Amino acid sequence: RFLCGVVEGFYGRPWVMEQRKELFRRLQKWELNTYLYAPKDDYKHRMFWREMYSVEEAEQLMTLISAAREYEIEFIYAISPGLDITFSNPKEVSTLKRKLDQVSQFGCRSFALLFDDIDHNMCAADKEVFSSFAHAQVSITNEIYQYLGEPETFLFCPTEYCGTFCYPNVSQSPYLRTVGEKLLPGIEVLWTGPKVVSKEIPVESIEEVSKIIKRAPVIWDNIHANDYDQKRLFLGPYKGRSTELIPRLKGVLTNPNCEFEANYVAIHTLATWYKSNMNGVRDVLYSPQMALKLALTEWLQEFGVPHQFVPGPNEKPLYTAEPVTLEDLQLLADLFYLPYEHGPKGAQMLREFQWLRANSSVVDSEKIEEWRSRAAKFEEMCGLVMGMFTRLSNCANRTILYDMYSYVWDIKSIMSMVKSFVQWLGCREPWAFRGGLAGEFQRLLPI
Amino acid sequence: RFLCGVVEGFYGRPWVMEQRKELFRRLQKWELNTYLYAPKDDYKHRMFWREMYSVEEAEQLMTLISAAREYEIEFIYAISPGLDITFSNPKEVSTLKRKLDQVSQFGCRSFALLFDDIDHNMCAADKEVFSSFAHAQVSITNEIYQYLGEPETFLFCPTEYCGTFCYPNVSQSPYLRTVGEKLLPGIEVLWTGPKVVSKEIPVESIEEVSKIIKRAPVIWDNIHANDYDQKRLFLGPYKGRSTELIPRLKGVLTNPNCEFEANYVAIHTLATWYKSNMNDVLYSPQMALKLALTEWLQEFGVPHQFVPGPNEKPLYTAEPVTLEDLQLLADLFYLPYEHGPKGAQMLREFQWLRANSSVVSVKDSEKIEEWRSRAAKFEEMCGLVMGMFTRLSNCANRTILYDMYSYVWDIKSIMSMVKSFVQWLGCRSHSQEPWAFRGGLAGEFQRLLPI
Numbered sequence: 001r002f003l004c005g006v007v008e009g010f011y012g013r014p015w016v017m018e019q020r021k022e023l024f025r026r027l028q029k030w031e032l033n034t035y036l037y038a039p040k041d042d043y044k045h046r047m048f049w050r051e052m053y054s055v056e057e058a059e060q061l062m063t064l065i066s067a068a069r070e071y072e073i074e075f076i077y078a079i080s081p082g083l084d085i086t087f088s089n090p091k092e093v094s095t096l097k098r099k100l101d102q103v104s105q106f107g108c109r110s111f112a113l114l115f116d117d118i119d120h121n122m123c124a125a126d127k128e129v130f131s132s133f134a135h136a137q138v139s140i141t142n143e144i145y146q147y148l149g150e151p152e153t154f155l156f157c158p159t160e161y162c163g164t165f166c167y168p169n170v171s172q173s174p175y176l177r178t179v180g181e182k183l184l185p186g187i188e189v190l191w192t193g194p195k196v197v198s199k200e201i202p203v204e205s206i207e208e209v210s211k212i213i214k215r216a217p218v219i220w221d222n223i224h225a226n227d228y229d230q231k232r233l234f235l236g237p238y239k240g241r242s243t244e245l246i247p248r249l250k251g252v253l254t255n256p257n258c259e260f261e262a263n264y265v266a267i268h269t270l271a272t273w274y275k276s277n278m279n280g281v282r283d284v285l286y287s288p289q290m291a292l293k294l295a296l297t298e299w300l301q302e303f304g305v306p307h308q309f310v311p312g313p314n315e316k317p318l319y320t321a322e323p324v325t326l327e328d329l330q331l332l333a334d335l336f337y338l339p340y341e342h343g344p345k346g347a348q349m350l351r352e353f354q355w356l357r358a359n360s361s362v363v364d365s366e367k368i369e370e371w372r373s374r375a376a377k378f379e380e381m382c383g384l385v386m387g388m389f390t391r392l393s394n395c396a397n398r399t400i401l402y403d404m405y406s407y408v409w410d411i412k413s414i415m416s417m418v419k420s421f422v423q424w425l426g427c428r429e430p431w432a433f434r435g436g437l438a439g440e441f442q443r444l445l446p447i
Numbered sequence: 448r449f450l451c452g453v454v455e456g457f458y459g460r461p462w463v464m465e466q467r468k469e470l471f472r473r474l475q476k477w478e479l480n481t482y483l484y485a486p487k488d489d490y491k492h493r494m495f496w497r498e499m500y501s502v503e504e505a506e507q508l509m510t511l512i513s514a515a516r517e518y519e520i521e522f523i524y525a526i527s528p529g530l531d532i533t534f535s536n537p538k539e540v541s542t543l544k545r546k547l548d549q550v551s552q553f554g555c556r557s558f559a560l561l562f563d564d565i566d567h568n569m570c571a572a573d574k575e576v577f578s579s580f581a582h583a584q585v586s587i588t589n590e591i592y593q594y595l596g597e598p599e600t601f602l603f604c605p606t607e608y609c610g611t612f613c614y615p616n617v618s619q620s621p622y623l624r625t626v627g628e629k630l631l632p633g634i635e636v637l638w639t640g641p642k643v644v645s646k647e648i649p650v651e652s653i654e655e656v657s658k659i660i661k662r663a664p665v666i667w668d669n670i671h672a673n674d675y676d677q678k679r680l681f682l683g684p685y686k687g688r689s690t691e692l693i694p695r696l697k698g699v700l701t702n703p704n705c706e707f708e709a710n711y712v713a714i715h716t717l718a719t720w721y722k723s724n725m726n727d728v729l730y731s732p733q734m735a736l737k738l739a740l741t742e743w744l745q746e747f748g749v750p751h752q753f754v755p756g757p758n759e760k761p762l763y764t765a766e767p768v769t770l771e772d773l774q775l776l777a778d779l780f781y782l783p784y785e786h787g788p789k790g791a792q793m794l795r796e797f798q799w800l801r802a803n804s805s806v807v808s809v810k811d812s813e814k815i816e817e818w819r820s821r822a823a824k825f826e827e828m829c830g831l832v833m834g835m836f837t838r839l840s841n842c843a844n845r846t847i848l849y850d851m852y853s854y855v856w857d858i859k860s861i862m863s864m865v866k867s868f869v870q871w872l873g874c875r876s877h878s879q880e881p882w883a884f885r886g887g888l889a890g891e892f893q894r895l896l897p898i
C-alpha cells in the first residue's frame with residue numbers, strides 16, 4: 001500500500017477549489033492515488049488553526065472531499081498548530097480535537113499533524129510537563145490519533161524533517177530517537193531527504209533514517225517547489241530518486257510549483273516513475289529524459305484548447321498563424337528545468353555566451369571567422385526564445401499562459417538583452433534598478 | 448473637462464470582472480472619473496482583435512459597462528490591431544468597424560485605437576496606398592471616429608508615444624508632424640512623457656510635444672507599471688509630475704501594477720495630485736503617501752474563547768499590521784528610479800558596513816565602537832522587515848496578502864540573509880539550499896552583463 005501523489009504544502013497563494021478538483025482528475029488519469037491538504041497560508045490550516053470552518057467554508061470542503069472520493073484519491077487533511085500551541089494545556093488539546101472532528105464530519109478519514117518550520121523553544125508550562133520538545137509533540141500526536149479511532153493513514157511531519165536539520169546528525173539525534181521510540185507504530189513519518197530541496201535521495205540515506213524512526217518514511221518531495229525564489233519555475237523531470245527507493249518507502253508526495261498549470265511535467269513524470277517499478281523486491285527502469293518527452297507531448301495538446309481571414313501575397317500575415325510546438329515546450333523546460341541543473345539547451349546557451357564574452361577583445365582571420373559565426377549561431381538561438389514566447393502569447397489556452405506568463409516574459413527579456421550585448425560586442429528605462437532594492441542587496445553578497 | 452483615472456494597459460494576467468467593478472468603486476470614492484480598457488493579453492483586445500465577443504463574453508462586458516455608468520466613471524474601450532492589420536484593405540477596415548459596433552451595442556460611448564509596441568514596417572500593399580506609416584494609422588483612425596458619430600471621447604496612442612521613441616526627435620519627427628496636421632481635431636492623443644517610464648514629465652516637454660501634435664495630450668503614465676520586471680512592485684507616491692501640468696493636459700491615466708490590490712497607493716496618490724489643483728506648493732508626494740497608507744491600513748483587518756496564560760506561549764497572531772509596517776513596505780518597494788527613505792538608508796548602511804568590515808580584526812577603539820553599534824542598529828532594522836512580514840502573514844484580508852505575498856517574502860528572505868552576513872562579519876576571528884542557482888538561468892545571464 002503506497003501513498004503517491006501531490007501535497008499542496010507551499011507558501012503563498014493556495015490553489016482554489018476548481019483547481020484542486022482538476023488535480024484529482026489528473027492524478028486519477030496518471031494512476032496516482034493521494035492528495036495532502038497543507039497550504040501554509042490558507043489561514044485555517046496554520047495561522048488560525050484554532051478557528052472552526054464557517055458554514056460556507058464547510059460546504060466547499062465537503063464538495064472537495066467528495067470530489068476526491070469520486071476520483072479515487074485519498075484526501076489527507078493536515079493541520080499545523082506548531083507556532084503557538086501550548087502542548088500541556090487540555091483546553092488547547094481540546095480545541096485541536098474539535099477542529100479535526102469538524103473535518104471528519106465533512107467526510108475526511110485521513111489526517112496529519114505538521115511541526116515543520118518552527119523553533120524548538122517551548123514556553124515555561126510545557127518545560128515543566130514534558131522533558132523535551134519531541135516528548136510534547138509525540139504526546140499530542142499519539143493522543144489525537146487515538147481520539148480519532150486510529151485512522152488507517154495518519155501522518156506526522158517532524159521539525160527535524162531532513163538530514164541537514166537533524167541535530168547533531170540523523171543517527172544520533174535526541175529529537176528523532178524520541179520520535180522513533182515513542183510515536184505509535186501505525187503513524188507514518190514525513191521526510192524530505194538529505195536536505196530541504198534534495199538533489200538526490202540515496203537509498204542508504206533512507207535505510208539510515210528508517211532505523212532511528214523505526215518505519216519506512218513518506219517523502220515530502222520539494223524537488224519542483226518554487227515558493228522560495230521569485231524568479232524560478234521547474235518544468236524538468238522527476239529525477240535523482242532511484243526506483244529502488246519504492247519498496248523502502250511508505251510513499252512520495254511531491255510539493256510542486258505554486259502556479260497550478262506548470263505542474264503538468266512534475267506530476268506526470270512522478271507518475272511514470274511510480275508506475276515503472278510499482279512493487280519491487282525490498283538501478284533504473286526509469287529514464288528522466290524519456291519521461292520528460294512523454295509528458296511534454298501530452299501537455300502540448302492542452303495548449304490549443306480554450307480552458308475567417310487568410311491574408312494575401314502582398315498583405316501582412318496573421319501574427320497568430322503559428323501555434324505552440326513540441327520544440328517550443330522542450331526549449332521552455334530546458335530554460336526552467338530543475339533546482340540544481342539547467343536543461344541541455346539552457347546550459348548550452350549559457351556556455352556560448354560565457355565564451356563569446358570572454359573572447360570578445362578579438363574584435364586575425366582564424367579567431368574572427370570563429371567568433372562571427374559562433375555569435376550569429378547564438379543570435380539564432382536567442383531568436384528561438386522570442387519565437388517560443390510569441391507562440392505561447394497567442395495560444396488558445398489562456399489559463400496555462402497566465403500561470404507562466406511572468407516567467408516566459410522574463411527569460412525572453414533577458415535573452416533579448418543578451419542578444420543586444422553580443423550584437424554590441426560585434427560593433428566597435430528601469431535596468432540599473434533591476435530586481436529592485438532586493439536586487440541591490442543580492443549583488444553585494446558572495447554569489 | 449479632464450480625464451483622470453486608470454488604464455488597465457499592461458502585459459500579463461488581466462484583471463477579472465469583480466476587480467474592475469471594485470476599481471470603479473475606488474475611482475468614485477477618490478473623485479477620479481475615467482477607466483481605459485486595454486489589457487495587452489486579454490485575447491480579444493489585441494492578438495485576436497478581429498474575433499467578436501461570444502454571448503457569455505458579451506453579457507460580462509455589458510454588466511461591466513453598466514457598472515461604470517452606475518459609478519459615474521467614463522468607460523473607454525480600446526483596441527490594438529497594429530500587429531497584423533492591413534490598413535488599405537476595406538475587408539479589414541470593416542472587420543474593425545464590426546468589432547467596435549459590437550461593443551457600442553453593450554452601452555459603450557467612448558473608444559480608442561492603440562498603435563504602441565509595433566514596428567514601422569508596412570506590407571507592400573500598404574506602402575503603395577499610403578505614403579508613410581502615420582498616414583495609414585491616421586486614415587483608419589479618422590474613419591473609425593467618423594463612423595462612430597464623432598464620440599465625445601476618442602483616444603489615439605501613437606507608435607512614437609514618448610520622447611525617446613521619436614525619430615529623430617519630437618520637434619522634427621515626420622511621424623508626429625503627420626499625426627498633428629492630419630488626425631482630426633476632436634481626437635485626443637496619448638503620451639508617456641520623455642521616456643516609456645518617465646521619472647519626470649517636465650512642463651517644457653509637454654509644451655514641446657503639444658506644438659507638434661497640435662493639442663494638449665493625455666498621459667499614459669507608466670510610473671507604477673511592473674510588468675517589465677518580475678521582482679518589482681511600486682507602492683511609492685505619484686511623483687515627478689508638476690501640478691502645473693494639469694492646465695496643459697487633457698488627462699492622466701495611470702497604467703499601474705499588475706497585482707490589483709497593490710495599486711491602493713498608486714491610484715490614491717494620483718487622485719490627491721489631481722484634486723490639489725483641479726482648476727508647485729500644493730502637492731507633496733511624501734504627505735500624499737501617508738494619507739494613502741493610513742487609509743489602506745484599515746483594509747488589512749477586514750476579511751475580503753482562548754486567551755493564553757502567564758506561563759503559556761502567547762498568540763503568534765496577536766499583533767496586527769501597523770501603519771509603520773506599511774510605511775516600511777512602501778519604502779522597500781517604492782518607485783522605478785528611487786527607493787524610499789528607509790530602504791535607501793538600509794542599503795547605505797549595508798554598503799558602509801561591508802566596505803569597513805576589516806576594522807573588526809586589525810587594535811582600534813574609534814572605528815570598532817562605530818562599527819559595532821552601526822551593525823546592531825542595522826540588525827534592528829532587518830528585524831523590522833521580518834516583523835512586517837509576519838504581521839502581514841496574519842492579516843485578515845487575505846486578498847491583499849496574496850497579491851503581495853511573493854514580494855514581501857522575497858525582501859524578508861534577502862534581509863534575513865543580509866543580516867546573517869553582517870553577523871558573520873562581526874565573528875571574523877571565527878570561520879546551502881538553492882542559492883548558487885538564485886534567479887535561475889535568467890539570473891546567471893543577468894550577472895554577466897554590465898549592470
Ligand SMILES: CC(=O)N[C@H]1c2[nH]c(C(=O)Nc3ccccc3)c[n+]2[C@H](CO)[C@@H](O)[C@@H]1O
Pocket residue numbers: 009010011040116117157161192196220222225227228255880
Ligand atoms: C517540510 C517542508 O518542506 N516544509 C516547508 C519548507 N521549509 C523550508 C525551510 O525551512 N527552508 C529553510 C530554512 C532555513 C534556512 C534555509 C532554508 C523550505 N520549505 C519548502 C520549500 O520552500 C516549503 O514549501 C515547505 O512548506
Ligand SMILES: CC(=O)N[C@H]1c2[nH]c(C(=O)Nc3ccccc3)c[n+]2[C@H](CO)[C@@H](O)[C@@H]1O
Pocket residue numbers: 456457458487563564608639643667669672674675702
Ligand atoms: C504606452 C505603453 O506603455 N505601452 C506598453 C509598453 N511598451 C513598452 C516598451 O516599449 N518597452 C520597451 C522598449 C524598448 C526596450 C525595452 C522595453 C513598455 N510598456 C509598458 C511597460 O512595460 C506596458 O505596460 C505598455 O502596455
